[PDB]
């Protein structure tokens, strides 16, 4: 009943009854499966997760230069040297500066200068290698148990959660009161992770060509040195300036964040809702209703009158949802339901929520059914006090 209220909702039914059925699941898609003498089920892919990522490299897109140290020597006094030179968190460069009487040297000539600055990364991106077989899929199987709160209930645990990998596709899922459904899936990702790197940038991700990722002119750390200090190629974002042989100055090159996004236009993007990855690709699955059974069926019809406890609402697909409460006696009971013409001659329109039953009298039942076009009569219960409700469907 979880699918009710979703636009991209697919109504799938089996051929030759419905023993087996093929369904395609995607992020945003929702599938309602129907099979004869089998309970109607709602399937929805809710999560996709790369489970054993290997960081290849980590790139610095935003760099900060702090703890600047400078040392200079007079002409004929040797090359200056700082202990920050041996320190790998620092970036150093030597140069020559004009020295004289006026700046503190007994003799005129070129004097050695050395500037060092601590390279601290502000923002970075990561390049993770994902094994295709290690993509975990979370699917919710919510049956059409008329249940008072079932209808579009996202959080309240009405459905069974099951995890699939391209590796392990076949799964048996137990639905309490219905039995077991078997799922043989097959992922249709659209783009494989073969010689692809998953380039993650804070809240955005891309699928990029390996050699392209390994060729970016940015400071980097290896997969072997995560939480490391020694950034390779600091020079790609740090530049030294000495154009008048007076003073050496260190300069950064500014955030490459935006610059990157531009290069990543001709790259497959991957989105993120609530911090998790939403893969564009599909997922074809084969179902088996063989060990599935309708809850009850061995029950007797409802002797008493029914009460419409909530106004009939039409879904975006033309189907209608009706919340009815039992005021009679017999529960656990079986709801008599029929959609007919204006003279009760022919039984028109199908029932989506197959085999509607009452468990507790106090608990209302949500019945979903596809009414026919034009004028129809929704009939809930048996004589006397049969709920007759006229329906409009252009």
């Amino acid at each position, epitope marked *: 009943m979880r699918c009710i209220g979703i636009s991209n909702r697919d109504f799938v039914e089996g051929v030759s009854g419905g023993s087996w059925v093929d369904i395609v699941l995607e992020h945003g898609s929702c599938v309602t499966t129907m099979a004869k003498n089998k309970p109607t089920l709602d399937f929805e892919l809710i999560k996709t997760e790369a489970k054993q990522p290997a960081t290849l490299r980590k790139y610095c897109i935003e760099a900060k230069l702090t703890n*600047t*140290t*400078t*040392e*200079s*020597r*007079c002409p004929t006094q040797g090359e200056p040297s700082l202990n920050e030179e041996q320190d790998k968190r620092f970036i150093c460069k030597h140069s020559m*500066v004009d*020295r004289g009487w*006026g*700046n*503190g040297c007994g003799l005129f000539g070129k004097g050695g200068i050395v*500037t060092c600055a601590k390279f601290t990364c502000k923002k970075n991106m990561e390049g993770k290698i994902v094994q295709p077989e290690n993509l975990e899929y979370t699917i919710v199987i919510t049956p059409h148990s008329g249940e008072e709160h079932a209808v579009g209930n996202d959080t309240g645990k009405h459905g069974k959660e099951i995890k699939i990998t391209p590796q392990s596709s076949t799964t048996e899922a137990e639905l309490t009161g219905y039995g077991t459904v078997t799922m043989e899936c097959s992922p249709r990702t659209g783009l494989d992770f073969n010689e692809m790197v998953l380039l993650q940038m804070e809240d955005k991700a891309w699928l990029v060509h390996r050699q392209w990722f390994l060729d970016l002119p940015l400071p980097w750390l290896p997969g072997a040195d995560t939480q490391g200090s020694n950034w390779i190629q600091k020079e790609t974002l740090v530049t030294f300036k000495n154009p008048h042989a*007076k*003073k050496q*100055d260190v300069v950064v090159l500014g955030s490459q964040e935006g610059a990157m996004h531009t290069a990543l236009t001709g790259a497959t993007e991957i989105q993120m809702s609530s911090g998790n990855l939403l893969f564009t690709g599909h997922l074809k699955c084969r179902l088996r209703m063989d060990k599935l059974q309708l809850k009850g069926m061995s029950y007797s019809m409802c002797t008493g009158k029914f009460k419409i406890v909530k106004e009939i609402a039409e879904t975006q697909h033309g189907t209608i949802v009706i919340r009815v409460q039992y005021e009679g006696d017999g529960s656990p009971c079986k709801i008599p339901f029929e959609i007919t013409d204006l003279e009760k001659r022919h039984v028109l329109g199908r029932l989506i929520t197959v085999n509607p039953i009452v468990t507790e009298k106090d608990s209302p039942v949500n019945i979903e059914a596809e009414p026919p076009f034009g004028d129809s009569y929704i009939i809930v219960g048996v004589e006397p006090g049969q709920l007759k409700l006229n329906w409009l469907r252009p």
Partner: antibody, heavy 130, light 106 residues
């Protein structure tokens, strides 16, 4: 030739305080400026130094990491940033001008080892209690 | 940098204040600095570059340099010289250190 000082007062341990030292009567941009501590009833302790632009800076091992020096030649002022101030850092902070280096380096930029210095002009100081 | 605790001397008498602190480099002692500070008041540069004396500072104030020691001489004590004297030098090429402090008692 003045060296005015401001920023002192009540400070709780492990807290932030910025000390400003104003200047007039000399080419401030061209002089190395210094920070020197002195307990209520004890001896002088050299804290920090800055060259003309602030490229060469030095700090006492006692303050290294928790302290930071800075200056802007526009306002003709020198600053001392003190973060995570421990109780043992209680004293009267002084800002001094290294006037002797100017007789040698008319630029006050070049960070040489053991260059001739001499803290010429001193400020009245400012007391901090932590 | 170790300076004697206190040096006492009669008016007219000539005294000397020592300054020695571990450092094994001629770069240090040849660059010793001396400061005259009265209680509560701000310090004053009396000697720079071990022997050099700035204008204003009295002739009586002298500056000596030893191999691993520094000395401040007050040739002819006067009542006005009763103050605190602090020596100063290079810890490292880019670092300064003050001495223990000598209390001059006339």
């Amino acid at each position: 030739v003045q060296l005015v000082e401001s920023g002192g007062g009540l400070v709780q341990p492990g807290g932030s305080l910025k000390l400003s030292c104003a200047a007039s009567g000399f080419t401030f941009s061209s002089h190395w400026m210094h920070w020197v501590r002195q307990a209520p009833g004890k001896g002088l302790v050299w804290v920090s130094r800055t060259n003309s632009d602030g490229s060469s800076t030095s700090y006492a091992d006692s303050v290294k990491g928790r302290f930071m020096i800075s200056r802007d030649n526009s306002k003709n002022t020198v600053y001392l940033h003190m973060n995570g101030l421990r109780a043992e850092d209680t004293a009267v902070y002084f800002c001094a001008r290294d006037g002797v280096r100017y007789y040698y380096d008319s630029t006050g930029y070049y960070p040489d080892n053991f260059f001739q210095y001499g803290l010429d002009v001193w400020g009245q100081g400012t007391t901090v209690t932590v | 940098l170790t300076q004697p605790a206190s040096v006492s001397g009669s008016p007219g008498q000539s005294i000397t204040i020592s300054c020695t602190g571990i450092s094994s480099d001629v770069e240090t002692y040849n660059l010793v600095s001396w400061y005259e500070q009265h209680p509560g008041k701000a310090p004053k540069l009396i000697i720079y570059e071990a022997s050099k004396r700035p204008s204003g500072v009295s002739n009586r104030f002298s500056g000596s340099k030893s191999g691993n020691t520094a000395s401040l001489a007050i040739s002819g004590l006067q009542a006005e010289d009763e103050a605190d004297y602090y020596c100063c030098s290079y810890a490292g090429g880019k670092s300064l250190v003050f001495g223990g402090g000598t209390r001059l008692t006339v």
